[PDB]
Design a protein around this ligand. Structure first.
Ligand SMILES: *[C@@H]1O[C@H](CO)[C@@H](O[C@@H]2O[C@H](CO)[C@@H](O[C@@H]3O[C@H](CO[C@H]4O[C@H](CO[C@H]5O[C@H](CO)[C@@H](O)[C@H](O)[C@@H]5O[C@H]5O[C@H](CO)[C@@H](O)[C@H](O)[C@@H]5O)[C@@H](O)[C@H](O[C@H]5O[C@H](CO)[C@@H](O)[C@H](O)[C@@H]5O)[C@@H]4O)[C@@H](O)[C@H](O[C@H]4O[C@H](CO)[C@@H](O)[C@H](O)[C@@H]4O[C@H]4O[C@H](CO)[C@@H](O)[C@H](O)[C@@H]4O)[C@@H]3O)[C@H](O)[C@H]2NC(C)=O)[C@H](O)[C@H]1NC(C)=O
Lengths: 62, 109, 52
């Protein structure tokens, strides 16, 4: 229910997920300029080039 | 003006790459975007900010094939793993377009 | 004739041009001629072994 929601190498920040959500994700991919990490709540569907991870603990998406 | 404030308003023909879902043609709705940004500078040297929450369609010429349902502009901040405190900015305008399905109903269906 | 005109009529959907209305009128009239000719032939080929 509590996840990390910061991006890339930004200082750490957290959020409270919606009631009934139990997960936390971590998307990583590279564009023309560099590497982007997207942390949030849930477990989404990603296109076939992204390194997606999902964890059902707490603050475990860093 | 004498304070140095500059207002420049040039014309442009924009040709944007818009994905076209055709599942429901000729009764289809499209979401077309226009991503704008500074090419060689980052948000610490040249910052951009939208003028209004949504495009200006006060002098918009009605189409004949499309109806404007909604339009908005969103500004994004992007950070990369390499550079921890350098943001890359872009304003993205979207236009939700509904097609008028009379020509294709009378000519094909 | 519809094919002939397919490349010369404006592609706008605020109204239908009178020429396309005329073509659809003639097309539906021909269709109904076909239907009623089928009906006439059906009546003509009836006999007591099949119909009273
Ligand atoms: C047609 O197609 C269109 C294009 O595909 C599509 O457009 C999309 O529409 C949706 C809306 O429906 C858009 O989503 C919104 O986007 C907003 C902008 O997002 C960007 O900016 C965010 C803010 O960044 C600032 O703040 C951060 C902290 O909050 C800082 O970390 C940042 O550094 C930055 O700080 C700067 O600004 C601060 C304040 O301005 C200031 O204090 C500070 O000093 C500094 O100056 C970013 O967070 C965001 O990044 C997220 O998303 C990207 C992916 O997009 C991830 O990679 C990132 O990791 C990150 O997670 C963007 O860069 C959002 O603000 C807005 O969010 C709000 O609403 C959502 C709803 O889901 C909430 O989840 C969210 O918490 C926010 O909630 C708050 O506001 C809502 C009301 O708005 C309300 O509930 C309540 O008030 C709440 O507090 C939202 O996500 C989307 O961006 C569009 N995509 C585009 C344009 O590409 C359109 O929908 C389609 N139409 C259809 C299909 O119908």
């Amino acid at each position: 229910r509590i996840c990390f929601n910061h991006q890339s190498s930004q200082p750490q920040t957290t959020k409270t997920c919606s009631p009934g959500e139990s997960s936390c994700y971590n998307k990583q991919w590279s564009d023309f300029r560099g590497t982007i990490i997207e942390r949030g709540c849930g477990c989404p569907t990603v296109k076939p080039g992204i390194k997606l991870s999902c964890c059902e603990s707490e603050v475990c998406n860093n | 003006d004498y304070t140095g404030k500059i207002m420049w308003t040039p014309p442009a023909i924009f040709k944007s790459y818009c994905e076209i879902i055709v599942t429901h043609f000729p009764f289809d709705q499209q979401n077309c975007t226009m991503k704008l940004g500074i090419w060689t500078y980052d948000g610490t040297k040249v910052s951009i900010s939208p003028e209004s929450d949504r495009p200006d369609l006060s002098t918009f010429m009605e189409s004949g094939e499309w109806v404007m349902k909604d339009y908005r502009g969103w500004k994004h901040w992007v950070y990369y793993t390499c550079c921890p405190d350098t943001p890359y900015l872009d304003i993205t305008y979207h236009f939700i377009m509904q097609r008028i399905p009379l020509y294709f109903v009378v000519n094909v269906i | 004739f519809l094919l002939l005109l397919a490349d010369k009529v404006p592609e706008t959907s605020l109204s239908v041009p009178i020429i396309i209305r005329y073509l659809m009128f003639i097309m539906i009239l021909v269709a109904f001629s076909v239907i009623l000719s089928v009906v006439v032939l059906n009546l003509h080929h009836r006999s007591p072994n099949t119909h009273t």
